[PDB]
Design a protein around this ligand. Structure first.
Ligand SMILES: O=c1ccn([C@@H]2O[C@H](CO)[C@@H](O)[C@H]2O)c(=O)[nH]1
Length: 121
């Protein structure tokens, strides 16, 4: 009766500002978990007024810019970002991302675009 398991095959996969997102389709008010694949960066800076962003780095290396502060990241690191924190990032990475409470695009605010030449990856 209840669906517990979601697959990549049945997910929604799309590119957003340079990252490849896998949105599984599960609904849970407390958290959204998605996959992120990034080749060079997320070339837009935004913040979320309601939800924290927690990135687990499966593989690769990158750098997060959190309120303009560089935060290096490598495989097996956990990057935790509170609400109301400006976020962009560069890197070649595979990640698991938790947005808590559940992701709602209406909670996010655009700050600026980032030139693709700014990524050192
Ligand atoms: O469920 C989610 C989680 C994150 N993002 C996007 O992922 C990027 C940050 O990794 C941002 O563009 C953010 O809006 C989504 O589109 N949906």
């Amino acid at each position: 009766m209840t669906k517990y398991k979601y697959t990549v095959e049945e997910s929604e996969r799309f590119n957003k500002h340079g990252i490849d997102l896998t949105v599984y389709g599960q609904v849970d008010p407390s958290a959204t978990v998605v996959r992120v694949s990034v080749e060079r960066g997320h070339f837009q800076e935004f913040f979320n007024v309601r939800s924290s962003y927690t990135f687990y780095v499966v593989s690769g290396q990158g750098v997060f810019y959190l309120n303009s502060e560089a935060v290096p990241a490598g495989a097996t690191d956990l990057i935790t970002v509170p609400p109301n924190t400006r976020i962009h990032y560069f890197g070649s990475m595979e990640m698991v991302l938790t947005v808590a409470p559940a992701f709602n695009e209406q909670d996010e605010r655009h700050v600026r675009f980032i030139s693709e030449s700014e990524s050192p990856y």
